[PDB]
Every structure is written in C-alpha cells, then in structure tokens.
Design an enzyme around this catalytic site. Sequence first.
Site, PDB file in Angstrom:
ATOM      1  N   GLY A  23     -42.371  14.556  63.880  1.00  0.00           N
ATOM      2  CA  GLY A  23     -42.786  13.924  62.633  1.00  0.00           C
ATOM      3  C   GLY A  23     -41.619  13.639  61.722  1.00  0.00           C
ATOM      4  N   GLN A  24     -41.897  13.488  60.435  1.00  0.00           N
ATOM      5  CA  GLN A  24     -40.868  13.067  59.504  1.00  0.00           C
ATOM      6  C   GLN A  24     -39.775  14.125  59.322  1.00  0.00           C
ATOM      7  N   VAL A  27     -38.890  17.913  64.956  1.00  0.00           N
ATOM      8  CA  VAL A  27     -39.605  18.192  66.172  1.00  0.00           C
ATOM      9  C   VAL A  27     -39.890  19.688  66.170  1.00  0.00           C
ATOM     10  CG1 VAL A  27     -39.322  18.188  68.693  1.00  0.00           C
ATOM     11  CG2 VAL A  27     -38.341  16.338  67.307  1.00  0.00           C
ATOM     12  N   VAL A  28     -41.051  20.105  66.665  1.00  0.00           N
ATOM     13  CA  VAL A  28     -41.353  21.518  66.847  1.00  0.00           C
ATOM     14  C   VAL A  28     -41.526  21.808  68.333  1.00  0.00           C
ATOM     15  CG1 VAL A  28     -42.904  23.402  66.229  1.00  0.00           C
ATOM     16  CG2 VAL A  28     -42.535  21.560  64.614  1.00  0.00           C
ATOM     17  N   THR A  86     -39.831  30.786  64.139  1.00  0.00           N
ATOM     18  CA  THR A  86     -40.955  31.524  63.577  1.00  0.00           C
ATOM     19  C   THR A  86     -41.894  32.019  64.641  1.00  0.00           C
ATOM     20  OG1 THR A  86     -42.676  29.818  63.332  1.00  0.00           O
ATOM     21  CG2 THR A  86     -40.958  29.862  61.640  1.00  0.00           C
ATOM     22  N   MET A  89     -47.962  30.212  67.157  1.00  0.00           N
ATOM     23  CA  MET A  89     -49.386  30.221  66.871  1.00  0.00           C
ATOM     24  C   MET A  89     -50.076  29.276  67.868  1.00  0.00           C
ATOM     25  SD  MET A  89     -49.628  32.299  64.248  1.00  0.00           S
ATOM     26  CE  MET A  89     -51.103  31.833  63.348  1.00  0.00           C
ATOM     27  N   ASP A 133     -47.724  24.223  48.203  1.00  0.00           N
ATOM     28  CA  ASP A 133     -48.390  23.162  48.963  1.00  0.00           C
ATOM     29  C   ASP A 133     -49.448  23.741  49.907  1.00  0.00           C
ATOM     30  OD1 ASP A 133     -49.028  20.589  49.983  1.00  0.00           O
ATOM     31  OD2 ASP A 133     -47.260  20.538  51.258  1.00  0.00           O
ATOM     32  N   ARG A 137     -53.613  21.749  56.460  1.00  0.00           N
ATOM     33  CA  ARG A 137     -52.516  21.215  57.290  1.00  0.00           C
ATOM     34  C   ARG A 137     -51.302  22.172  57.391  1.00  0.00           C
ATOM     35  NH1 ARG A 137     -52.603  18.347  52.706  1.00  0.00           N
ATOM     36  NH2 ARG A 137     -51.032  18.898  51.197  1.00  0.00           N
ATOM     37  N   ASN A 138     -51.156  23.077  56.410  1.00  0.00           N
ATOM     38  CA  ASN A 138     -50.083  24.081  56.356  1.00  0.00           C
ATOM     39  C   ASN A 138     -50.485  25.477  56.814  1.00  0.00           C
ATOM     40  OD1 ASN A 138     -48.125  22.258  55.687  1.00  0.00           O
ATOM     41  ND2 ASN A 138     -48.575  22.383  53.511  1.00  0.00           N
ATOM     42  N   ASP A 151     -45.395  27.422  55.994  1.00  0.00           N
ATOM     43  CA  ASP A 151     -44.712  26.441  55.149  1.00  0.00           C
ATOM     44  C   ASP A 151     -44.610  26.876  53.685  1.00  0.00           C
ATOM     45  OD1 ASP A 151     -45.374  25.157  57.672  1.00  0.00           O
ATOM     46  OD2 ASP A 151     -44.781  23.290  56.743  1.00  0.00           O
TER      47      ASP A 151
HETATM   48  O1  LIG Z   1     -44.793  23.993  62.829  1.00  0.00           O
HETATM   49  C1  LIG Z   1     -44.401  25.172  62.792  1.00  0.00           C
HETATM   50  C2  LIG Z   1     -43.405  25.540  61.812  1.00  0.00           C
HETATM   51  C3  LIG Z   1     -43.717  25.348  60.460  1.00  0.00           C
HETATM   52  C4  LIG Z   1     -42.835  25.693  59.439  1.00  0.00           C
HETATM   53  C5  LIG Z   1     -41.606  26.239  59.766  1.00  0.00           C
HETATM   54  O2  LIG Z   1     -40.720  26.584  58.798  1.00  0.00           O
HETATM   55  C6  LIG Z   1     -41.153  27.371  57.747  1.00  0.00           C
HETATM   56  C7  LIG Z   1     -42.137  28.367  57.892  1.00  0.00           C
HETATM   57  C8  LIG Z   1     -42.522  29.132  56.782  1.00  0.00           C
HETATM   58  C9  LIG Z   1     -41.942  28.904  55.529  1.00  0.00           C
HETATM   59  C10 LIG Z   1     -40.961  27.910  55.382  1.00  0.00           C
HETATM   60  C11 LIG Z   1     -40.565  27.155  56.491  1.00  0.00           C
HETATM   61  C12 LIG Z   1     -41.260  26.423  61.092  1.00  0.00           C
HETATM   62  C13 LIG Z   1     -42.137  26.080  62.103  1.00  0.00           C
HETATM   63 CL1  LIG Z   1     -41.612  26.347  63.716  1.00  0.00          CL
HETATM   64  C14 LIG Z   1     -44.964  26.148  63.669  1.00  0.00           C
HETATM   65  C15 LIG Z   1     -44.664  27.473  63.567  1.00  0.00           C
HETATM   66  N1  LIG Z   1     -45.322  28.168  64.498  1.00  0.00           N
HETATM   67  C16 LIG Z   1     -46.034  27.314  65.234  1.00  0.00           C
HETATM   68  N2  LIG Z   1     -46.818  27.630  66.287  1.00  0.00           N
HETATM   69  C17 LIG Z   1     -47.475  26.595  66.883  1.00  0.00           C
HETATM   70  N3  LIG Z   1     -47.377  25.304  66.446  1.00  0.00           N
HETATM   71  C18 LIG Z   1     -46.583  25.023  65.401  1.00  0.00           C
HETATM   72  N4  LIG Z   1     -46.513  23.733  65.017  1.00  0.00           N
HETATM   73  C19 LIG Z   1     -47.334  22.647  65.571  1.00  0.00           C
HETATM   74  C20 LIG Z   1     -46.666  21.321  65.191  1.00  0.00           C
HETATM   75  C21 LIG Z   1     -47.464  20.189  65.713  1.00  0.00           C
HETATM   76  C22 LIG Z   1     -48.869  20.273  65.172  1.00  0.00           C
HETATM   77  C23 LIG Z   1     -49.581  19.111  65.824  1.00  0.00           C
HETATM   78  O3  LIG Z   1     -50.944  19.280  65.508  1.00  0.00           O
HETATM   79  O4  LIG Z   1     -49.475  21.575  65.459  1.00  0.00           O
HETATM   80  C24 LIG Z   1     -48.758  22.712  64.995  1.00  0.00           C
HETATM   81  C25 LIG Z   1     -45.867  26.030  64.750  1.00  0.00           C
END
Ligand SMILES: O=C(c1ccc(Oc2ccccc2)cc1Cl)c1c[nH]c2ncnc(N[C@@H]3CC[C@@H](CO)OC3)c12
Length: 270
Positions: A23-24, A27-28, A86, A89, A133, A137-138, A151
């Site tokens: 996304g913007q 990549v995860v 992190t 999930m 926020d 979605r978060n 987030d």
């Molecule tokens: O997206 C993050 C993440 C978020 C914040 C961050 O940074 C911060 C976290 C907390 C506070 C500040 C920044 C890092 C990370 Cl890695 C995930 C962390 N764990 C996960 N487990 C499974 N899926 C994940 N993401 C997908 C992405 C695609 C999506 C499409 O529907 O579905 C969920 C994540």
Amino acid sequence: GLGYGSWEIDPKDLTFLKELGTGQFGVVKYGKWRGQYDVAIKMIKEGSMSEDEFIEEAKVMMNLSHEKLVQLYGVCTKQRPIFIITEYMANGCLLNYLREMRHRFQTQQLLEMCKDVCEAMEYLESKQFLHRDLAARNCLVNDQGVVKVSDFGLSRYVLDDEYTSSVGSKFPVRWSPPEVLMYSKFSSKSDIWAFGVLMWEIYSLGKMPYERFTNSETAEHIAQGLRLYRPHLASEKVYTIMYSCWHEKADERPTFKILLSNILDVMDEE
Ligand SMILES: O=C(c1ccc(Oc2ccccc2)cc1Cl)c1c[nH]c2ncnc(N[C@@H]3CC[C@@H](CO)OC3)c12
C-alpha cells in the site's frame, strides 16, 4: 549483538515467507525471526515517514506491553527501507474479518471484540498514550480470534498532508469528534469517540460509518449534533455504550475504564 540497540533487530535474523499486503506506506510480510518466532515485517516506503522521530518513539513503544495490544518487537534502522517488526496476527485486519459473512458471528463474539479493544485502550490511557487513529482498519485478529489494537500513535510520523489534517482526503473524518473537526482538539476523549465508532463498525459487520455521506457531509452532520444510529445486531444496552462515546461535550464522554466496566456488565446480562 554488537552494533544494535535494544530497540534494533538485525535484519539478517529474518526469514521472509509470504507477502501479506502492499500500500501507500509499504509492504507487509510474514516471516520468522531466528528460524522459530513468527513475526510481521512492515517495510516502510521511502519518503513516507518522519523516520528519526519514529525511531525515537519506537524506544517508548518497546515498553508498551499488553495482551490486547500488538507487540512491537523492534525496528531495522541501518538500511533503507527501514523495517518495523511486530507480533504476527494470522487472521489479518479486523475490518476485512468483519466483512467476511461466512463467520456468522454471534453477538457475544462481537462484544468480545469490543472488550479486547477496550482493554488495550484502557491500558494505553493508563500510560497517557493516545492512539490518534483508532478504527477497525487499525486492529488485527490472531489465529485464536483475539482482536488487538495496532498502529497506535503512528499517524504522528506520516508525511503525506492528505492524511494529516481534517481537510485531507485521507484524514479519519468519520472517526473524529466535533472538536477535532472544528479546531484540531485531540485528547483522550477523541480516542473515546473513535472507540464508539469502532464498536459501531463491529456491530455493523464492517460497514463504512455514515456510508451514504461524503466526509464533508459527515462533518456537517456531526457538528449539527447528529449521530450514527443503532446497528441491527446491537442490543439497546450495547447501543447505549457506543452512543455514550459521542457526547458533544468531550468531558461528558466516559473513560476507557468506565467503558470496560459497562461492557463487562452487558456481557454478564446478555
Ligand atoms: O500490518 C501490520 C503492521 C502494522 C503496523 C506496524 O507498525 C506499527 C505497529 C504499532 C504501532 C506503530 C507502528 C507494523 C506492522 Cl508489521 C501487521 C502487524 N502484524 C500483522 N500480522 C498480520 N497482518 C498484518 N498486516 C496485514 C497487512 C495487509 C492487510 C490486508 O488486508 O491485512 C493485515 C500485520
């Protein structure tokens, strides 16, 4: 080891296994740390974040730990793009999860999701840490169906002005109280407002709040004192809880401790 602070992960310890999203902001990926430990790895898009400020804040965030808060394990800072590591999930984003009708959720499950989020937010409030926020979605969902807040505080480090103030196309108008929309007054009570909207999202199975309105129409609606209304799956008592988050006067909105007590009461009663 040598060359790494307590907040720093050696990216050589990572094994990348699957792409989860793009996304913007990057990549995860899903991977392992030191061959064994599941992690999520967010690769931050160059130019998208105030990285030095974020890294300093990551040191604070390392000390936040709660069972309903997604755990920050560290950051990879020596190269670009930088990585955020992190807790993984497995069931992904809460918003997507709610929208999958196959789950056929019972309302008891929906209330448990609300409680999971409320516990995390009560913890953050006890640490004087604003989410800024909060929205479905978060939030993320693990392989046991437990919802955790993610987030937290991250919006402070986003450089794109479309995201950063009320006028922007990507500002969370639909999760914002009147005092945020009118004069940028953020507080514990703007997280409370957002939590009520999140409860509405949960009980609406992931509908967009104010789905028939634009952001501009939403701002006008709420500033005229009008509100979301009761999702069909919310009982009267559940609706009372979410609605209490939307008092026009911020100081009349509950705390997260009070919300948690109210949610637990409803769990016992319904
Ligand atoms: O997206 C993050 C993440 C978020 C914040 C961050 O940074 C911060 C976290 C907390 C506070 C500040 C920044 C890092 C990370 Cl890695 C995930 C962390 N764990 C996960 N487990 C499974 N899926 C994940 N993401 C997908 C992405 C695609 C999506 C499409 O529907 O579905 C969920 C994540």
